[PDB]
């Protein structure tokens, strides 16, 4: 029926000792390079990408949709460049959810000029539940989330036909 887009982990605060300014030519906009407005790229700064345990408690009293990604680089050295750790883990939990992500190096065929890929994942934190993110590298952290309301009388239609 409705939802509301809201900055779950704000860029200019929530990531103090990680460099958030990650961008790509593959996500081009009007000439320049850009990225996903609802997601956010965390890279290693100064020394390393130190351990993180970013948490969000569902206050909203609505099903909050959370979207995060996991980056799988194509070259051994690129992994050690942007994330300063050769063996990385991404952990995503809720009261009734668990998943452990181990990104692995693969020189895959070039889709939109990228041998390396980002896998996209999603969950719905129920009102009252808490989402905790443990990582030491390769996490494409969320930026904006969606706190939906639902209500059938809606659907996905594939049409060419114009609106009036």
């Amino acid at each position, epitope marked *: 029926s409705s939802f509301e887009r809201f900055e779950i982990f704000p860029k200019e605060s929530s990531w103090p000792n990680h*460099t958030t*300014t*990650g*961008v*790509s*030519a*593959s*996500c*081009s906009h009007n*000439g*320049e*390079s*850009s*990225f996903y407005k609802n997601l956010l*790229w965390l*890279t290693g*700064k*100064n*020394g390393l990408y130190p351990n993180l345990s970013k948490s969000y408690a569902n206050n909203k009293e609505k099903e909050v949709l959370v979207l995060w990604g996991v980056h799988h*680089p*194509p*070259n051994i*050295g*690129d992994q050690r*460049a*942007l994330y300063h750790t050769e063996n990385a883990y991404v952990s995503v939990v809720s009261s009734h959810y668990s998943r452990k992500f181990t990104p692995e190096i693969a020189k895959r065929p*070039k889709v939109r*000029d*990228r*041998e*390396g890929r980002i896998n996209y994942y999603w969950t719905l934190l129920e009102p009252g539940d808490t989402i905790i993110f443990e990582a030491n590298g390769n996490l494409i952290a969320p930026r904006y989330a969606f706190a939906l309301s639902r209500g059938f009388g809606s659907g996905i239609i594939n049409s060419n036909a114009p609106m009036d």
Partner: antibody
Amino acid sequence: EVQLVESGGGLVQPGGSLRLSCAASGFTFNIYDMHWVRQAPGKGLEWVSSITTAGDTYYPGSVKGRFTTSRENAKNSLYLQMNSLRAGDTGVYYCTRGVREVGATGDDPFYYGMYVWGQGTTVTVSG
Amino acid sequence: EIVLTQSPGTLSLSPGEKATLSCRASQSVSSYYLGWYQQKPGQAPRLLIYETSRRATGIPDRFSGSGSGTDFTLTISGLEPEDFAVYYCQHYGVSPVITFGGGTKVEIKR
């Protein structure tokens, strides 16, 4: 191979306007941040402008006022608009390539440093 | 804010020798950003060292780079005739201020 061809002018009025053009060749432009480093008539290297792949311009207090950086990822060129030019704004202006985006495959190496340099183009203010 | 003070002001040695030029900034620099560039007389500058230790993708082995936090050093073991340049240490990275600035005018004087 890799090359940064710098072009522009030489003479302007004190408080005048000039534009510099930086042609590039031998590498993928759009995935590298760019900069302008000036060496005074005397000596001493100083950074004046820097633009990301995203188009975010950063300037030093010396020149924050009247200088502006632009990019034509299409024309493989980078530009510097030098407005209301001061006295000390004299010297040789250089074109440089530092860091590879973040999201740029893994082929072209990722490092914090400037590698490809240009020959320069000398700029002076009148009397 | 970040001040890259390059000591000595001027360095002068005979060929075949070893040179040690230092560069110490106000606060800690956390290595990964600091590099060294050779301003060869009458020409465009050139990169030699990056991320502190790192060598250039086409530069001699005579040149060594090392240091941490405040104090940093580029060490030329060979000191050939070509190796008589002015040199500068630069702080390139997440700041956005590049800082730069340097002296150490490595010349002959025998």
